[PDB]
Amino acid sequence: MTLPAFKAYDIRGRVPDELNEDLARRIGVALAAQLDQGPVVLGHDVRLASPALQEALSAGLRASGRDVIDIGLCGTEEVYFQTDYLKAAGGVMVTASHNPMDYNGMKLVREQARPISSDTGLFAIRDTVAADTAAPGEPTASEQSRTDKTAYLEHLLSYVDRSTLKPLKLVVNAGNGGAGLIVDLLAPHLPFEFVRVFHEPDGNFPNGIPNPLLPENRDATAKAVKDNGADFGIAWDGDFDRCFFFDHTGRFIEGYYLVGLLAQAILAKQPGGKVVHDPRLTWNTVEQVEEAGGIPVLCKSGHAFIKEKMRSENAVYGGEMSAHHYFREFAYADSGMIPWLLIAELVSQSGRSLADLVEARMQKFPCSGEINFKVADAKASVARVMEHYASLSPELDYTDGISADFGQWRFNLRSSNTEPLLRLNVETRGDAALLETRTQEISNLLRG
Ligand SMILES: O=P([O-])(O)O[C@H]1O[C@H](COP(=O)(O)O)[C@@H](O)[C@H](O)[C@H]1O
Numbered sequence: 214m215t216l217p218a219f220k221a222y223d224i225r226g227r228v229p230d231e232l233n234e235d236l237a238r239r240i241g242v243a244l245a246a247q248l249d250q251g252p253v254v255l256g257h258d259v260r261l262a263s264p265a266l267q268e269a270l271s272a273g274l275r276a277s278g279r280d281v282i283d284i285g286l287c288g289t290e291e292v293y294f295q296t297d298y299l300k301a302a303g304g305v306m307v308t309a310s311h312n313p314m315d316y317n318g319m320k321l322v323r324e325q326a327r328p329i330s331s332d333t334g335l336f337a338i339r340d341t342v343a344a345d346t347a348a349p350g351e352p353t354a355s356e357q358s359r360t361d362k363t364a365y366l367e368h369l370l371s372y373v374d375r376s377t378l379k380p381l382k383l384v385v386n387a388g389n390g391g392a393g394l395i396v397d398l399l400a401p402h403l404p405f406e407f408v409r410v411f412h413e414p415d416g417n418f419p420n421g422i423p424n425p426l427l428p429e430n431r432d433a434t435a436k437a438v439k440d441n442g443a444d445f446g447i448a449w450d451g452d453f454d455r456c457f458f459f460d461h462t463g464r465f466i467e468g469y470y471l472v473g474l475l476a477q478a479i480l481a482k483q484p485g486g487k488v489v490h491d492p493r494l495t496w497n498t499v500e501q502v503e504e505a506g507g508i509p510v511l512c513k514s515g516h517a518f519i520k521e522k523m524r525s526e527n528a529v530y531g532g533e534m535s536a537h538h539y540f541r542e543f544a545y546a547d548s549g550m551i552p553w554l555l556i557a558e559l560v561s562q563s564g565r566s567l568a569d570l571v572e573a574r575m576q577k578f579p580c581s582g583e584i585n586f587k588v589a590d591a592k593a594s595v596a597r598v599m600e601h602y603a604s605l606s607p608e609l610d611y612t613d614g615i616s617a618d619f620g621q622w623r624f625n626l627r628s629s630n631t632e633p634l635l636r637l638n639v640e641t642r643g644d645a646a647l648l649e650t651r652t653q654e655i656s657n658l659l660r661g
């Protein structure tokens with residue numbers, strides 16, 4: 214077979230049987246053979262095994278003559294930012310995202326933090342690692358510790374006019390991941406009053422692995438917002454490249470609506486720009502982008518496709534409904550920090566609550582949320598759906614799975630590239646009844 218830890222977009226597996234120090238060292242050796250000239254940036258998340266996996270990565274890179282820039286405990290976006298900022302050959306973030314306690318992984322990038330994915334070098338690395346029985350060499354290059362975050366923090370702060378900010382009260386919930394360290398470094402430069410929940414980094418995860426989409430974890434942020442009368446709340450996953458928003462009522466805001474809101478925020482600063490969006494949920498983003506004078510650009514979902522499209526279009530901003538937000542000046546990379554700075558600025562400048570900023574949009578384009586189906590035969594299930602609706606003659610688009618536009622409602626139905634699943638998204642033109650009846654109809658067809 215092949216090493217299971219090598220996935221479409223990154224390396225992910227149980228340690229020590231799918232990922233371990235020896236594999237990590239071999240990955241460093243193989244990565245050195247794939248990169249252009251230059252040093253390699255390494256960072257890690259709060260998981261207990263991450264430092265040792267990073268050290269093994271470093272040992273293999275340095276045995277292959279690569280200088281290593283160790284930026285320490287960080288978020289994924291810091292590896293991206295520093296790789297691009299320092300004009301490094303590439304970078305690796307050691308992180309387990311929201312996988313169980315016995316899991317870890319790696320996200321790899323080359324120059325300008327461009328992704329290394331299964332078809333752009335990651336399976337080449339896998340096959341090299343798989344065949345490598347060579348004795349470990351000794352280091353021929355050095356490691357430098359570079360924990361200074363100044364350039365990163367200045368970059369984050371450059372997205373807002375600090376003189377226009379109001380002293381909003383913000384709940385922040387790191388989930389014992391890494392986000393609190395960055396919040397605390399930003400706080401002396403911001404007027405906000407922070408209510409800190411699950412704030413200290415702790416790889417033992419006493420309050421659960423960080424995942425704000427789980428209702429149990431969601432409610433902890435919601436409760437803190439309501440109990441403290443906060444203006445809004447923000448929660449992150451463990452490597453904080455995903456951010457999640459709660460309005461002043463404690464209501465979690467579906468990530469779809471943040472794409473259009475953040476696009477408007479960015480277009481206010483970079484007028485007329487292009488905005489890249491995914492095909493799962495679309496109508497609200499297209500309308501909000503156009504109303505703000507921007508140009509919406511449809512793109513297949515997944516960070517590699519989004520980033521490539523943004524580069525080829527010089528797009529100012531890209532956003533996915535799955536809580537990933539990409540910014541041109543940020544090495545075209547995703548940040549879990551830039552979005553809440555922009556939203557805080559919007560609330561401060563407009564005098565409108567986060568709830569009011571999105572309320573009418575949610576009524577105008579209600580969506581199902583992403584619903585996942587594990588079925589016996591994905592292809593036959595999709596066919597059952599398309600056969601059922603054929604006589605209505607929807608407009609069909611195959612950018613990413615199947616999108617079907619019926620006029621007052623549409624759906625997208627995809628196979629996941631990270632899991633063996635079918636994913637469904639439905640939205641309507643202001644019609645919650647149609648939304649429910651069509652979602653339930655498709656669900657029944659899929660399960661049949
Ligand atoms: O899950 P993450 O945070 O690593 O994110 C990854 O998977 C998500 C879901 O992909 P899919 O719907 O094909 O399963 C993508 O939207 C995202 O761009 C990608 O980087």
Ligand SMILES: [Mg+2]
Pocket residue numbers: 289310450451452453454455
């Ligand atoms: Mg993440």
